[PDB]
Design a binder for these strands. Structure first.
Lengths: 11, 311, 38, 39, 288, 147, 180, 42
RNA sequence: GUGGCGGCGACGACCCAUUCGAACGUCUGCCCUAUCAACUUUCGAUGGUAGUCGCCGUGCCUACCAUGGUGACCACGGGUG
RNA sequence: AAACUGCGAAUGGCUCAUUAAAUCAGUUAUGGUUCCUUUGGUCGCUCGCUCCUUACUUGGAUAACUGUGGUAAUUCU
């Protein structure tokens, strides 16, 4: 989890 | 060759590094001038109004380059050859952290509070400032990335590569918009305006590039083979400001006519131009730091208003 | 030859500084003394 | 050692032969009292 | 007093228009070999009044050569070797006369930061000769002419004739100084060591000079009853060094063709004076 | 096998190995001269140290270390790390209040040179004190005797 | 501040220790001397006990030894080719100990024809043994020699070393070709 | 992962709220989208 | 005669030894808690080579390598007018 | 008198704001380092192109001192 890259959503 | 350059009594006292000066930079307001030097790596800031140094702060390691985040002298970021980024607040040292691989040069995107690391990795690291967490990595798929620049006009991020290929990225949506193809390594890369870009080569050729057309608009070759470390743009006289260690050349953007050339006693590490003035500040491999005033290029800066009387 | 002088507040002038007013320089272990421009 | 070295090299070393670019020296004495060194 | 005269002439714009400017120039050339550091500097500026196109661009390197602190750095970074040279090929002819006499003065007096005193004479001259190793044989002969100036009279005449006449033309009242002669041999020994690849043409006259003193020095060694005791030991050292170089020159140059007069000369001054008594001395240690 | 297994050249520091010679001596044998030292205190240099070819600066016989201080003994317990072993020393601690004893042990990491081979778990090892070779290692193996 | 203390390190078993004192004067550390190639620029540093340390910042010349021939000569430094510790010192042209450099070959050549009277580097009683391996001969034909530095410029202020030869030269040449 | 060789996403407290986002871009968002599609030969 | 020889002290001065020390190690041995049983690699944990820095030896630190080190014989963690 | 130079102030006092082999006790090593001071050693020159007649001693400054001053203001200058 420390290496999991977070994902963003275009607003 | 009718420029007849001056060389400078003492405008600012103790405008002298101990042995050498690596980088000299000026704040956007113009009241602060910052310089770093070996030995005992220092951060020395000189007040334009007071003509004296405000403070000095020694460092653990030599700083390859530093960039001024704040409008004033308050917030500054240093990148080290020891993979270290040190943050300095107004009072002094604030926070320090490392990166997995060495960083050649770094650029900060003022929108989105994202600060970019270009270095000895194919991936280009990204730093968010509003949120402490490191952002997602982006892979430039080239072995070594040398230089980077961000255009203030519309936010375009382009990184130089060891193979000589310039790769442009999009700060928003993190997508590679396109590629530019052109053995020599990319020495210097600068963004000037929306549609004009310049690439320096280790052979000594500074190349003018336009975004829409792959072919270069104009070519200028320094007869000496030394790489061009820094290229700058002067809007008022349409002059492209090209500097290498042996000599610095002044030439017009269109037709490439040469304005003048300045050769100092010892090599130049870095060159800086004060905004909207003919005064030129150069960083040399000498304890003294060069100050040169060009009357034809521009008028004297306000805090040095009396030079026009002295000429 | 203009060797030096004092302004109306008694502050001396220094050779190096080039200003019409007063500045705060580091003078002799150095302190921020206020000096008149040359 | 030195004298014994002088004797031996006169004994076991063959006569000089002329070669291109080198010509034997001319000595006025040439008394010359097997190889030359043995003589 | 000499410096005062030189300063006023150094501030003359056009030395060519000056009366009798011809005789002035060799006097400046003669003053280049001066031992004093101050004399050499003020001499150089008088030459620079003649803005000769070739010598002028190399002004700064010449001045730093005269500075004790910056001498050792300029020796490396003022290369005159044909492969890599700061001075251009066309400019070699003019610069070298000025460069040679300056280095000759530095050899005698001071050739670096710590190179002063009689003990350092070997180190001072050795640095100079390594720097001159890159020259051509025609360029090197200028320096050797200045080096062997006091012994020119031995060069004249044939090899065997010069050896014999030197012995006859020997007076105990007047001789060349022994200490200076000791410097000449120390000069000659290091020269043949390092620039041997540039010494072949001038080699025969070296054998003339080397043999001439050796014949003479033995002659005083014969007449010990008429000489002071203190002089005996320096004369012995001079004879020892003279044979050793003859030993060294014979050791190398195997392909060199020695003329008949040369073979006659070497026996006159080296072999014959000591061949008869060889049984007395060699027993303790091998003689030269 | 091959001694050059690191990025830098492995060379025994006190041996000059580029001496030029005639072709007659070159044809004979290219045998480098080995350096070894007697550590004293009655300990004999193993023949593998004299005849071997390994490069180890921390060998008591072929390296640049000095043996001085305490000479101790133990039983070899673990052989898993490079050129160093883990040994155990057992003893009894005496309680005056109960006038009895309790069993205690100590664990020591000591440097093992390649000159000692055929070393198994559970044999007697005598080691000698040297300067700290690393953060946790201060003793060098001097003799190994089988169980 | 650069501290080379021991109480900032974790313990052998892995636990951390809380400091009982702040940094002492005798535990100080100093910024590294990244010696480059350029005009000679050196800085003197006062150390504990009142002695001096010569901190070389820019060097261009140094004396090197031809060990097999035993000929020590002072020559310029040309470039940096290989470094055991890191490639970044190679890229930035940084002089540290045991790095491999290129040096000029003129003084060794001049000594060779002054000694053996046999030509070298030219285009197409135990006696003197004038024999040179093919690698070194080709190096003189190229005009530059590979050398290994033995001194620390950051401590003594000078760059001294020796010309690479033999199997060491072969190993380092194999590394140089392998890195490319 | 030794010596921070591998990227980690733990929160950094000292860098938290270090700057405030300030934006000065004249070009409107619809104009930005059209330009990037039109960039280079595309 | 700008002759030649000289006493007892004061101060300073390169290096060696000695004293006063100072600083890193070796061994031996610490109170309570297991309702703390696993810990260390959570910005190096163990070691190898080369280097920077340091008065020196040394993961002290940096580059490139292996996967190690400790523990019921109680590691580690927590306490303890 | 004033001033220039040298030495010490790091010891003794005093003190409300930290800490389980981290400190501490005993033994042991300097062949892996540092050192003001006390004490004992050591502290001369043949010649070696510097030529002809400073080692009976070589160079450049600055305080104290005289005198002219400025400001609300230091013994600041």
């Amino acid at each position: 989890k420390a290496f999991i890259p977070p994902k963003e959503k275009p607003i | 060759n009718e420029v007849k350059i001056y060389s400078l009594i003492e405008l600012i006292q103790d405008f002298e590094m101990p042995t050498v000066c690596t980088t000299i930079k000026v704040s956007k307001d113009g009241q602060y001038i910052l310089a770093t030097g070996t030995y005992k790596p220092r951060v020395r800031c000189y007040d334009t109004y007071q003509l004296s140094l405000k403070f000095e702060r020694c460092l653990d390691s030599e700083v390859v380059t530093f960039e001024i985040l704040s409008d004033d002298y308050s917030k500054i970021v240093f990148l080290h050859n020891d993979r270290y980024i040190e943050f300095h607040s107004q009072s002094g040292f604030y926070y320090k952290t490392r990166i997995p691989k060495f960083g050649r040069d770094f650029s900060y995107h003022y929108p989105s509070c994202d600060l970019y690391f270009v270095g000895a990795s194919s991936e280009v690291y990204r730093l968010n400032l509003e949120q402490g967490r490191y952002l997602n990595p982006l892979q430039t798929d080239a072995a070594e990335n040398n230089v980077c620049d961000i255009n203030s006009v519309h936010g375009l991020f382009a990184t130089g590569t060891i193979e000589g290929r310039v790769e442009c990225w999009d700060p928003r949506t993190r997508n590679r918009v396109g590629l530019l193809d052109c053995l020599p390594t990319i020495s210097a890369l600068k963004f000037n305006g929306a549609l004009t870009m310049a690439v320096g080569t280790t052979t000594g050729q500074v190349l003018l590039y336009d975004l829409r057309s792959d072919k270069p608009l104009l070519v200028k070759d320094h007869q000496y083979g030394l790489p061009i470390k820094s290229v700058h743009f002067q809007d008022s006289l349409d002059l492209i400001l090209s500097a290498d260690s042996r000599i610095v050349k002044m030439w017009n953007k269109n037709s490439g006519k040469i304005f003048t050339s300045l050769e100092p006693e010892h090599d130049l590490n870095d060159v800086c131009l004060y905004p909207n003035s003919g005064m030129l500040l150069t960083a040399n491999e000498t304890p003294k730091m060069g100050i040169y005033y060009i009357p034809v290029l521009g008028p004297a800066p306000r805090w040095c208003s009396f030079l026009d009387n002295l000429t | 030859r203009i060797s030096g002088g004092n302004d109306k507040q008694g502050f001396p002038m220094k050779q190096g500084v080039l200003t019409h007013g007063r500045v705060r320089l580091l003078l002799s272990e150095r302190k921020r003394k206020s000096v008149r421009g040359c | 050692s030195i004298v014994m070295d002088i004797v031996d090299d006169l004994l076991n070393l063959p006569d000089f032969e002329p070669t291109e670019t080198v010509l034997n020296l001319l000595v006025t004495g040439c008394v010359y009292p097997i190889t030359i060194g043995g003589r | 007093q000499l410096i005062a005269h030189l300063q006023v002439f150094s501030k003359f714009s056009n030395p060519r228009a000056l009366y009798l400017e011809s005789k002035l120039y060799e006097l400046y050339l003669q003053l280049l070999l001066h031992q004093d550091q101050m004399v050499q500097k003020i001499t150089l500026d008088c030459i620079m009044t003649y803005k000769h196109p070739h010598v002028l661009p190399y002004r700064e390197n010449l001045q730093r050569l005269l500075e004790d602190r910056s001498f050792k750095e300029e020796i490396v970074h003022f290369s005159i070797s044909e492969d890599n040279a700061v001075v251009k090929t066309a400019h070699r002819a003019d610069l070298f006369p000025i460069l040679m006499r300056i280095l000759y003065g530095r050899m005698k007096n001071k050739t670096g930061s710590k190179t002063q005193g009689k003990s350092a004479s070997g180190t001072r001259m050795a640095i100079v000769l390594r720097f001159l190793a890159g020259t051509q044989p025609e360029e090197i002969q200028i320096f050797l002419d200045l080096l062997f100036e006091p012994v020119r009279h031995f060069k004249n005449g044939e090899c065997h004739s010069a050896v014999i006449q030197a012995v006859e033309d020997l007076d105990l009242s007047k001789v060349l100084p022994l200490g200076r002669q000791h410097g000449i041999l120390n000069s000659l020994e290091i020269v043949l060591k390092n620039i041997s690849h540039l010494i072949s043409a001038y080699l025969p006259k070296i054998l003339q000079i080397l043999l001439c003193m050796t014949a003479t020095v033995s002659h005083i060694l014969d007449q010990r009853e008429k000489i002071q005791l203190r002089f005996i030991n320096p004369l012995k050292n001079l004879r020892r060094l003279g044979i050793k170089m003859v030993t060294d020159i014979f050791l190398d140059w195997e392909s060199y063709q020695f003329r008949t007069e040369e073979i006659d000369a070497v026996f006159h001054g080296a072999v014959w004076p000591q061949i008869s008594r060889l049984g007395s001395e060699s027993q303790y240690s091998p003689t030269p | 096998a091959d001694i050059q297994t690191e990025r830098a050249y492995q060379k025994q520091p006190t041996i000059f190995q580029n001496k030029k010679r005639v072709l007659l001596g070159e044809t004979g044998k290219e045998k480098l001269p080995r350096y070894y030292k007697n550590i004293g205190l009655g300990f004999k240099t193993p023949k593998e140290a004299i005849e071997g070819t390994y490069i180890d600066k921390k060998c008591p016989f072929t390296g640049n270390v000095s043996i001085r201080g305490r000479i101790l003994s133990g039983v070899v317990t673990k052989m898993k790390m490079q050129r160093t072993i883990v040994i155990r020393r057992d003893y009894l601690h005496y309680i005056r209040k109960y006038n009895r004893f309790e069993k205690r042990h100590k664990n020591m990491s000591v440097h093992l040179s390649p000159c000692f081979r055929d070393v198994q778990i559970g044999d007697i090892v005598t080691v000698g004190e040297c300067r700290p070779l690393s953060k946790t290692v201060r003793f060098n193996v001097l003799k190994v005797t089988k169980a | 501040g650069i501290s080379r203390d021991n109480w900032h390190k974790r313990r052998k078993t892995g636990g951390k220790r809380k400091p009982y004192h702040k940094k002492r004067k005798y535990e100080l550390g100093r910024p590294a001397a990244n010696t480059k190639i350029g005009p000679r620029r050196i800085h003197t540093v006062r150390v504990r006990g009142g002695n001096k340390k010569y901190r070389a910042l820019r060097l261009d010349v140094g004396n090197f030894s031809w060990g097999s021939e035993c000929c020590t000569r002072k020559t310029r430094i040309i470039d940096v080719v290989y470094n055991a510790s890191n490639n970044e010192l190679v890229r930035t042209k940084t002089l540290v100990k045991n790095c491999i450099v290129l040096i000029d070959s003129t003084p060794y050549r001049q000594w060779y024809e002054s000694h053996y009277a046999l030509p070298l580097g030219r285009k197409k009683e135990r006696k003197k043994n004038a024999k040179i391996s093919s690698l070194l001969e080709e190096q003189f034909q190229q005009g530059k020699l590979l050398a290994c530095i033995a001194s620390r410029p950051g401590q003594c202020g000078r760059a001294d070393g020796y010309v690479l030869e033999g199997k060491e030269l072969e190993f380092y040449l194999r590394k140089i070709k392998a890195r490319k | 992962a030794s010596k921070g060789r591998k990227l980690r996403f733990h929160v950094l407290s000292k860098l938290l709220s270090f700057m405030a986002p300030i934006d000065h871009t004249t070009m409107n968002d619809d104009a930005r989208t059209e330009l990037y599609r039109s960039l280079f030969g595309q």
